[PDB]
Amino acid sequence: VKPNYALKFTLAGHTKAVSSVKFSPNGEWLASSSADKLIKIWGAYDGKFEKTISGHKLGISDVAWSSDSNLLVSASDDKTLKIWDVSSGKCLKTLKGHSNYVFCCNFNPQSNLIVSGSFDESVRIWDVKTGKCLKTLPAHSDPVSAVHFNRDGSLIVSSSYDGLCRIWDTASGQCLKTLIDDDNPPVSFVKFSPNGKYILAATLDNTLKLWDYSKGKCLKTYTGHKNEKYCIFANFSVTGGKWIVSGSEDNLVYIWNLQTKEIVQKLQGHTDVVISTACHPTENIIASAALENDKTIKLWKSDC
Amino acid sequence: VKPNYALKFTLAGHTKAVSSVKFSPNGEWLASSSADKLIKIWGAYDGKFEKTISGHKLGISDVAWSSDSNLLVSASDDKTLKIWDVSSGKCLKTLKGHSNYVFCCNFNPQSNLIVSGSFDESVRIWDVKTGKCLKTLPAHSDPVSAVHFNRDGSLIVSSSYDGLCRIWDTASGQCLKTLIDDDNPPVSFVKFSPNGKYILAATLDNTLKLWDYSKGKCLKTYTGHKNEKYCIFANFSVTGGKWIVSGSEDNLVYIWNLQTKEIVQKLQGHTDVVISTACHPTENIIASAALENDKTIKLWKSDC
Numbered sequence: 001v002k003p004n005y006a007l008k009f010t011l012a013g014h015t016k017a018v019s020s021v022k023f024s025p026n027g028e029w030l031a032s033s034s035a036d037k038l039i040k041i042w043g044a045y046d047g048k049f050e051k052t053i054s055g056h057k058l059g060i061s062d063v064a065w066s067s068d069s070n071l072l073v074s075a076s077d078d079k080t081l082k083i084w085d086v087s088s089g090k091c092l093k094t095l096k097g098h099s100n101y102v103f104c105c106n107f108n109p110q111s112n113l114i115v116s117g118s119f120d121e122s123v124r125i126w127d128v129k130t131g132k133c134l135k136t137l138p139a140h141s142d143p144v145s146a147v148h149f150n151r152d153g154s155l156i157v158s159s160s161y162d163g164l165c166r167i168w169d170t171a172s173g174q175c176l177k178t179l180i181d182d183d184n185p186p187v188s189f190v191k192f193s194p195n196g197k198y199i200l201a202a203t204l205d206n207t208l209k210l211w212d213y214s215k216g217k218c219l220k221t222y223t224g225h226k227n228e229k230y231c232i233f234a235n236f237s238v239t240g241g242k243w244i245v246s247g248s249e250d251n252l253v254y255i256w257n258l259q260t261k262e263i264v265q266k267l268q269g270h271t272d273v274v275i276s277t278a279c280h281p282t283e284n285i286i287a288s289a290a291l292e293n294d295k296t297i298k299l300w301k302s303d304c
Numbered sequence: 305v306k307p308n309y310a311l312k313f314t315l316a317g318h319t320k321a322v323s324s325v326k327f328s329p330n331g332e333w334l335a336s337s338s339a340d341k342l343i344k345i346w347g348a349y350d351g352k353f354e355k356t357i358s359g360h361k362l363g364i365s366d367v368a369w370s371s372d373s374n375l376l377v378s379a380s381d382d383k384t385l386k387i388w389d390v391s392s393g394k395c396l397k398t399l400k401g402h403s404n405y406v407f408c409c410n411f412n413p414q415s416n417l418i419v420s421g422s423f424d425e426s427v428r429i430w431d432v433k434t435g436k437c438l439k440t441l442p443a444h445s446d447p448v449s450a451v452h453f454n455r456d457g458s459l460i461v462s463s464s465y466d467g468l469c470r471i472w473d474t475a476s477g478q479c480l481k482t483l484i485d486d487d488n489p490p491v492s493f494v495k496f497s498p499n500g501k502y503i504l505a506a507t508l509d510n511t512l513k514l515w516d517y518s519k520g521k522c523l524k525t526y527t528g529h530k531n532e533k534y535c536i537f538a539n540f541s542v543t544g545g546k547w548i549v550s551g552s553e554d555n556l557v558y559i560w561n562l563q564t565k566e567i568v569q570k571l572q573g574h575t576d577v578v579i580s581t582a583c584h585p586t587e588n589i590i591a592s593a594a595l596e597n598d599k600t601i602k603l604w605k606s607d608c
């Protein structure tokens with residue numbers, strides 16, 4: 001009924017704060033993005049450094065994989081996203097059009113679109129083929145913290161420091177829903193669950209929440225961790241037991257029982273804020289990454 | 305504790321026996337193969353016809369989708385497999401290689417390989433892009449009934465009327481595991497559990513078996529139905545309750561509790577052997593198809 005994640009590998013190479021870590025859909029790779037303007041690719045099972053991807057002028061806030069594990073998309077302070085062919089390292093497109101820091105990016109499932117969120121308070125939908133920007137949405141009244149497509153690409157969920165999550169219609173560009181609770185703390189992270197039916201949202205009041213999308217109703221909450229300042233990713237972990245996983249400003253990775261909401265494990269080991277965590281698509285592996293006073297990435301494995 | 309599948313739509317069009325129905329991964333469509341040498345596509349939620357896809361001689365034992373819901377593969381009595389662009393009907397490749405009927409086929413989760421079984425006793429790994437066999441395996445000492453990739457694509461499971469299931473390494477082709485019970489009744493159908501950790505095998509002694517294939521031990525047995533002749537598809541249902549779902553030669557769809565092995569629902573309405581059943585990816589929806597004297601497809605929905 002509890003997991004037993006244990007540190008197995010530690011992966012150093014970034015010269016500044018790590019901003020995001022993502023496993024690839026095929027289970028083979030980890031991608032990490034840093035304030036140092038670099039993407040590094042690491043063996044997902046052994047931590048073996050693999051290669052560095054370069055080309056952003058300023059720091060990178062976020063990276064994301066395409067469905068086939070062959071592309072990355074990066075979001076940088078340089079106001080652009082870049083689309084990368086991971087095997088060649090070649091930068092295929094640079095998406096230009098945001099007027100400030102791009103904070104968050106994601107592919108849709110079909111992987112012919114990219115969605116991005118910016119300090120400029122907009123959400124833009126792009127063509128991964130042509131690089132052209134297909135839509136700009138006046139999404140929020142503060143910086144956008146996350147953007148995620150749902151399981152068939154028809155919906156986008158965004159979150160903002162303005163305290164809202166919104167669900168947008170991909171084709172039409174129309175705001176279909178605005179999620180609000182009793183209070184409106186800034187929302188630092190949002191994503192759909194794999195089956196498209198729930199939304200996991202993190203707010204800068206030391207709180208994660210699970211929303212039923214179609215009823216716009218909040219089902220569970222998870223607390224015990226520290227999150228008042230940074231956009232700390234949250235994950236569904238589903239390959240063994242059923243957990244939520246999140247970084248934390250007290251340097252620990254928290255893991256909660258999905259259903260009870262009870263904290264079941266606190267992974268001790270990093271030395272600065274744990275900004276990002278990722279869950280391996282098929283194995284009970286967790287990756288964690290920390291900020292400036294640490295710069296390392298950590299691989300944990302559990303029996304469930 | 306018990307489902308409540310009810311009939312919602314009946315789908316008529318095939319002029320001979322239906323051989324297999326499969327929902328598309330994006331939840332949107334249903335394909336059907338037939339001894340009438342056609343494939344038909346139907347909307348998955350309302351049953352509306354879509355289009356027909358012709359070009360086989362001798363009729364189609366099996367049809368399988370690709371990961372993005374864009375390509376079909378189909379194993380035909382004309383000794384060949386054919387990969388179809390679902391949007392244009394156009395046959396994109398005519399996989400030639402087998403020396404007898406092609407009975408079963410499937411994409412790997414990456415959808416750059418296609419696996420296939422045949423009356424000729426051999427499994428072939430094809431290449432989607434080039435349409436050339438990459439490996440021919442001396443799979444079995446009788447016709448092979450089913451071939452299936454597991455979740456992470458690293459294994460192929462196959463069953464045969466020789467009474468064996470075998471696990472193949474996708475990369476090397478090597479046989480890693482042969483499963484045999486106390487007897488060896490012909491194995492009419494096999495597939496991996498959706499997490500790839502287990503195997504569900506149907507044998508022509510009216511029996512379904514859940515197999516842990518590494519240990520090589522049978523874990524659970526499901527009887528109550530009739531299956532002595534036909535390669536009848538079985539499935540795991542996991543969108544609501546956890547069930548095993550299978551057709552039956554007494555024209556009923558059998559549903560068992562995954563753990564207890566008890567029958568929880570028999571669906572009446574078909575008038576000939578229920579050859580094929582398929583579970584919807586996101587909703588508690590079941591599709592079932594019958595042989596020649598019935599010729600229809602039925603859609604059933606359940607609350608749990």
Ligand SMILES: *S(=O)(=O)c1cc(C#C)cc(CN2CCN(C(=O)c3ccc4c(c3)ncn4Cc3ccccc3OC)[C@H](C)C2)c1
Pocket residue numbers: 193194195196197198210220236238239258259281498499
């Ligand atoms: S709801 O019924 O109220 C509800 C509430 C709560 C709580 C608290 C939890 C759930 C859990 N479900 C199931 C898991 N899930 C998914 O969106 C989901 C995740 C991953 C999925 C998936 C659905 N379908 C396929 N996959 C991929 C996968 C992963 C591991 C092994 C196999 C596999 O696919 C074969 C939600 C959290 C809702 C429901």
Ligand SMILES: *S(=O)(=O)c1cc(C#C)cc(CN2CCN(C(=O)c3ccc4c(c3)ncn4Cc3ccccc3OC)[C@H](C)C2)c1
Pocket residue numbers: 238241242497498499500501502514523524542543562563
């Ligand atoms: S083994 O540990 O001994 C064993 C034995 C028996 C018996 C009898 C049953 C099981 C059940 N488990 C889990 C279910 N399962 C899967 O193949 C499977 C797991 C997770 C899946 C899935 C299939 N499809 C989607 N997902 C993700 C998902 C979807 C919906 C809800 C939850 C969810 O993940 C939490 C096998 C039968 C093995 C094990």
Ligand SMILES: [Cl-]
Pocket residue numbers: 191
């Ligand atoms: Cl994600």
Ligand SMILES: [Cl-]
Pocket residue numbers: 498538539540541583
């Ligand atoms: Cl199944």
